[PDB]
Symmetry: C3
Subunit: 193 residues, 3 copies
């Protein structure tokens, strides 16, 4: 049972859910709220490491991650990020979303973007109960043309599903949660596993 548009509004109105800035009525429809693209990005520098050991020693993994990740890119006014076919990049939503303990969120991309090969997540689109922050995007261009991405564009959509009850270990209370207070296009923290 996803929340319909009307019930998304009522949750935002009660304060059970928060999205900041609040998208206007025109971006709240059916069962979704549209989200927008941020201005923070990150790319990869492959020439600095051979591989990433997903479950290796924490120090080695951490060092490899630091070598391979670019600095955070902040786009000048009227500047685009050019996402080329075959390229994975990180970005972020404009909006910060905060979920209560009794709700879960789901990121979709967009059919218009899908038909040009742009994936807005890499089999990870769950926004957990207790989540609070902007949402980091893993972009991949599976199409044949480079896509110019500009801050402010409509980039995806969120839906919302009540849980069977309130989560007992929501994300804000989980001591081994990686992504609380998530600022900008944060890189993988797989080394904290």
């Amino acid at each position: 049972m996803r929340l319909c548009d009307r019930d998304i509004e009522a949750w935002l109105d009660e304060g059970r859910l928060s999205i900041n800035p609040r998208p206007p009525v025109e971006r709240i429809n059916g069962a979704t709220v549209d989200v927008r693209l941020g201005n923070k990005f990150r790319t990869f520098r492959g020439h600095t490491a051979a591989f990433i050991d997903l479950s290796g020693p924490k120090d080695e993994v951490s060092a490899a991650l630091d070598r391979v990740m670019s600095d955070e890119i902040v786009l000048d006014e009227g500047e685009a990020f050019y996402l080329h076919p075959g390229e994975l990049a990180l970005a972020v939503t404009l909006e910060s979303v905060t979920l209560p303990a009794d709700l879960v969120g789901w990121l979709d991309g967009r059919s218009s973007l899908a038909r040009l090969g742009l994936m807005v997540h890499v089999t990870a689109h769950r926004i957990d109960p207790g989540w609070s922050g902007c949402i980091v995007l893993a972009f991949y261009n599976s199409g044949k043309l480079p896509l110019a991405l500009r801050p402010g564009m409509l980039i995806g959509a969120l839906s919302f599903e009540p849980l069977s009850g309130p989560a007992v270990r929501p994300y804000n209370r989980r001591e081994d949660a990686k992504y609380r207070n998530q600022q900008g296009a944060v890189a993988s923290r797989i080394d904290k596993d």
Copy 2:
């Protein structure tokens, strides 16, 4: 709450939900209905453009789109569409689906197709309340062999989720909705944002 198979049948009998043609009983099971491939495709002409500006002047965007999209391809008796590794293609379902204001639909592929690398959507699989039309597929072959696609093959599954109530701004009434009554392998209308 997804509609189970016997409730999918009930909703179809009752007529607010429509799938046309209606899959037989052997194709409605668990919490899904199987869907089949149509006969309309499009491909991409990359040599005609440097990039697509996904937030550019509506005129320039609309023109770049028109250069890069192939004419709609319609397949002869016994023809295959050969989907090569690394290529994005557009196709269409056989079936047309109609959802009322109080239902959302979700498109899956198939595990049998997944194990050969066939993706059937590009992070965009929500079928909205109020949707009426055949579903456009953005295919991507992530695998190691070309896959021959033939009209009428089983291509994916739809499941259906009641909303918390009837959407106030369903897809069929939304004046900025891009794809109402969609009737072939329709290219991106990202230029209408």
Copy 3:
């Protein structure tokens, strides 16, 4: 509605669904249960075949699948599988999962993995009511570095959604179901279509 963590635990306590071995409390949180990578893999041998006719004669398809699919690869203690950019491979969860006729499961990857391009499914992530067995993973590396995967690592998450009622044709009782009693890194059985 998804089951919250506390309810997931209840359903496990009561034998309502099964996950074997049972993940500990630190892996059940919010609306999910974390799952782990098994030790069986398959790759592809593209040189043995020109293509796969998904919808062709059953005979010929089966022969092609048998030529292209590798023998099952079984990794030792501590051993790694190197998943390189642009390569699909098959693998399997550590956990076996059994769902009743009134529940559907859903498979997510992990944000930490998404941010390095690891897809854990290829648009096929539904676990059906009536399912019983380990889950075959279709892995694709959309990123810029190779990724070492070790048996036992955290690979993804499961969420569980009650259906509108019991499925009348759950997976365990459906005649043309392909994947009952599976079986390690089982290849595509699309030839059974």
